[PDB]
Amino acid sequence: MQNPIIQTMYTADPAPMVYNNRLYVYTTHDEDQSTWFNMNDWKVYSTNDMVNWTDHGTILKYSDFAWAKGDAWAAQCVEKNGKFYLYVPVVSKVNNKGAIGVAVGDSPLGPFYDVLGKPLVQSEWGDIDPTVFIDDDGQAHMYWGNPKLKYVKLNEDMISYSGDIIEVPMTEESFGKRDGNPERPTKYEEGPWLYKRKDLYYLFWPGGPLPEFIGYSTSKSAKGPWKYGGIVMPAEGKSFTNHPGVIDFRGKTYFFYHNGALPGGSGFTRSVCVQELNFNKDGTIPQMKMTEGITKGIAALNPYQLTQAETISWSEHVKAFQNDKVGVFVRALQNGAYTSVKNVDFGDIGASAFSARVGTTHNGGVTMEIRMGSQEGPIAGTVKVPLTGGDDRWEIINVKLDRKITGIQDVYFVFKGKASSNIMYFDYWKFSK
């Protein structure tokens, strides 16, 4: 399928960003086997085609802020003049309560560094979930907060504010009515996201009472006042939280969210999803359910280039890792695990050779099958994966294919071996004419 878009790790709280005709999504990371929020670092993924997502690994950690105690929660990255500002909530060590920090990088992949050495903003309590938006006039605005929605106008430097922290009036006209809660007069729960289309500003937000849904408000200007719009997406699935990120890419609008749809998924082991966001003619948004996502890619993938093992459309029983020597790589966790890429254009001439960086800890009996169409589709080639000792050691295997491959294909790599776990590790692949 196409949702969740990442299956190699538990991801949540998606925050998209476009730079130079590429779509990135920054995410939080739920540790495996969590029964509570175990969130320590932030990830970024990217796509050129909306069906294949490249895993770029960790780009920031809570410990990159020397004053942070933990809790790497929902963040957002925005770009301006080739610099990338990543706004993050963390619990501070100084007073043991939430705060918003900011790191800055010169690429979407970083490296990102704490430029303040202290919080950008810390209130009385409830300093989580920042969203930042740069308007057409160049003015930058930040909203955040749980339980209270707060607002500040950011300076041009993007790393300070002047003025006060504005507590947005929690009105039933602005955010709807919840009943039976005085800490929470409205449906607003947390996680604001500020977006613009035509002449209208949108504030998307998780709403309560739990399990969370996604609601929205509208306004004529970025600073409010806000107008309740309705429910964008009702509560659904195994994750009691949902968290929105909305963005335009190549003339369409996309709605990122998360759920608990992976094996072992839950409210503490979530997974990021995406589907198209459709507007009515007046600019309102119809209620939508969780769908299977993007069914058709908007561009082809070139198989005659180095393509990462961690550029994945759909997979099962594969996890992602990284190290300093090769970067991000994937490991097959059991026999018959697979990765797939969609909309691969082998062209008219066709591919006759194939190369891959691979390895295994097992002595014999490890293969990777290149198949077309599905995990049981026709076999184009089989790679014998050599013993390397561990994922710090790798070999490149070049094979001639049983038959030249042409045209548009979906390519499946199936990993086979005699062991019960850790069948092999896979870094990148390529085809040759």
Q: How far is the CB of 432 from its own copies (least distance, A)?
A: 6
Is 236 marked active-site? no
**Tokens representing residue 319 in the block:** 């996890």
User: Which amino acid, 85?
Assistant: Y
Adjacent-strand bridge partners of 259? 271
3-state helix, strand, coil in the chain (%, to 5): 0, 50, 50
| Shortest CB 306 distance to its own copies, Å | 6
* Nearer residue to its own copies within complex by CB, 291 or 302: 302
Q: Which of 19, 90, 83, 81 is nearest to 56 (CA)?
A: 19
- How far apart CA 66 and CA 349 sit, in angstroms, is 55
| Residues from 55 through 84 that contact Ca ion (CB under 5 A) | 74
- Closer residue to Ca ion, CB minimum distance, 64 or 427: 427
Closest CB to its own copies among residues 280, 305: 305
- The DSSP string of 193-237 is EEEEETTEEEEEEEESSSSPEEEEEEESSTT---EEEEEEE---S
**Which residues inside 321-340 make contact with Ca ion, applying CB under 5 A?**
327-329
User: What is the rounded CA–CA span in Å between residue 416 and residue 369?
Assistant: 8
Contact partner at residue 74 from Ca ion, its own copies, none, CB < 5 to 8 Å by partner kind: Ca ion
Does residue 427 interact with Ca ion by CB under 5 A?
A: yes
Q: Which residue type, as a one-letter code, is found at position 99?
A: A
Is 32 marked active-site?
Answer: no
Q: Which residues are annotated as a binding site for Ca(2+)?
A: 243, 308, 310, 328, 427
Q: Give me the sheet containing 367-372, strands edge to edge.
A: 314-316, 337-345, 408-416, 367-372, 379-384
Tell whether residue 308 is a contact of Ca ion (CB under 5 A): yes
Name which of 48 and 308 has its Cβ closer to Ca ion.
Answer: 308
Q: Where does this chain bind its own copies (CB under 8 A)?
A: 20, 22, 31, 33-36, 38, 40, 48, 54, 56, 63-64, 66, 69-71, 80-83, 104, 106-109, 111, 113-118, 155-160, 302, 304-306, 324-327, 355, 357, 361-363, 387, 389-390, 392-396, 418-422, 428, 430, 432-433
What positions carry a catalytic annotation? 13, 190
Q: By the criterion CB under 5 A, which residues form the site for Ca ion?
A: 74, 308, 327-329, 427-428
